[model samples]
Target: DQRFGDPVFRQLAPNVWQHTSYLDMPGFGAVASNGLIVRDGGRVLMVDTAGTDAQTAQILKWIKQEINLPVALAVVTHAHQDKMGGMDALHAAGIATYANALSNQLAPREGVVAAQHSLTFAATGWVEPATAPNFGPLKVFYPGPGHTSDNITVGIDGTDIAFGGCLIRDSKAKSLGNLDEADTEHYAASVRAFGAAFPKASMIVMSHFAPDSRAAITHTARMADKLR
Candidate 1:
């Protein structure tokens, strides 16, 4: 039986927390997925899940018991299974979840559950990339597709923190890990655009790795260029 207090998280900043959990992913044995808990006043916002409902529950338990903060919202970075795998658990906990309109549409096709709220960035279609609307102190934007058609990055207001999802690779990454739904041709440009949009961003969070410097974005582009 899966316990509720299994997943552990580490605090990166005074208000930023990161959680990593390992799971058996398709084509990748015992892979780790990243999640975030950002503190906004007394409440918190979650980014991505632990790649499974059971693991998500453990993270939630830790949040409530250890941090004692209310999870106001959860934003899945994309429609990939690793990103939105905990949607069911969030729904069961009555925590509202939001995703880009494109991610919402692509969720079903990708065999993942869509978020309860669909966020629109102006008038865009299935794969439209635009500056997304802001929620509280956080600004969401789709700088263009890299990891997937619906991938988006989140920036916390007044901070150099940005969550790049899987679009931003880790420093040790040799190549783009999963490209089943990736756009390699445009991946580098998209990553550069994201970095340009947040010039002062010093910290980057990725889907499968720990937090890294902004240079990781350039490294990702370099790796993509090599793959091309």
Candidate 2:
């Protein structure tokens, strides 16, 4: 019974939880999106957010009440609404949001608030650069540009859990959903790059649906290839 109505939390690891919330879109009804809450050094780090403030607030409540740790930081995987829709709620809670430097530039221009901090990557390939910076116990890896130019994957240090955000499609995802911001030319390679960076991750949490094996990375890359 880890679920509380609108936002549901599922344990992915001893210190990792998958947070799911619903987003309502015209003609699409309620669509589910997922995020991550990772406990590192007694504090929490989050990934993405629910599609709305209220839904994200519900998750914040669950974390404080159930996990009993304050979320010290959050990272937006991309500038998409599903990834940053709860930016206001996060700001209200005083949690600093970290994102790709380029994402910060794009979010505000798209009417989304910029993150509190910006991160520059060491490389843009599937393999992370040796100099990539770690935020808490996780490292955000940009595998080129797949779902979006700013899309990234977060890997938990020494752990098997990985947060694929929206870049890695769920095994059940029929299609890539929204592609207005996608880069089809290099989309497949980016997805593959993300997969290559996390070879040991058996539990890859995807945003749109359930946490699944890393094979979903292959699925996403294959889907992107079909478009070309």
Candidate 3:
């Protein structure tokens, strides 16, 4: 029973929670898809570390305050700066992290590209070139970039929550983000593939969010179909 407030943290289901980052940017409605935190008893798993070290640290510290779990895993939704920047701090703290193989490939060796991108949203500061995160329960399935060539959604076994990374959004998420690497056909098929792969998923959490809802995949697929 968590109480809701500004930057509210809510448990949409048992053991699953959403940490809302207060962006409130005009037209950037719903903040970023939805940064998710899943608890597995004494262990915790985080999806897309949010916008900055400060923001992510707040989430991490709160998780510790609410539960007796350590952050055991982290999955970056894509190469998008908002999702991956926080790994600079998380990995330094020894939390295991991961992202699509594509992220590791295109991310500037000096990470200049990523750093410049971070400054757009992460007003706190920027992160440097770092190695890809490592450790448990990760599957890399790139059906080719729809929102950047390095999108990798993560799944936590036994939990009906699928961290769709950035590929999916709430039913009312009227439009999609800029699709630089998108292949419309592959993107739509990937949506169906995700639906088929995780038929029982109670909700789909995106790297950016409007809180969240189970209708995310349905909404995304419908949008993809209309794109044709």
Q: Write model 2 residue lDDT over 1-228, tens digit each, in one string.
A: 544438888988888888888787768766788999899877888998888888889989989999888888898888877788889999999998888878888997666778888777775543233433346677778888777888888888767988888888876678987888889899998888878888888888888868888778888889999977
Q: Whose TM-score is greatest here? A: 2
Listed in order, each prediction's TM-score against the native is: 0.89, 0.90, 0.74
State the lDDT of candidate 1 residue by residue for 23-67, as single tens digits: 786675777788788888878888888788988988899888878
Q: Write the per-residue lDDT of candidate 3 for residues 1-228, one digit (tens) a residue.
A: 643323457785687787766443347553543677877667887777756666678788888788768888776666655676576768766777665445655666414123222201111111112432333333324434455555656555566666677787668878767665566666776776666666666766676665356677878878877666
Top candidate by lDDT: 2
Give candidate 2's whole-model lDDT: 0.82
Residue 147 in candidate 3 has what lDDT? 55
| Alpha carbon deviation, residue 108, candidate 1 (Å) | 1.2
Task: Return the TM-score for candidate 1, rounded to 2 decimals.
Answer: 0.89
What ranges in model 2 sit over 4 Å off? 1-5, 124-134
Q: Local error of candidate 3 at 12, Å?
A: 2.7
Provide the overall lDDT of each model, using Cα atoms, as 2-decimal numbers. Answer: 0.80, 0.82, 0.61
Candidate 1 Cα deviation (angstroms), residue 86 = 0.6
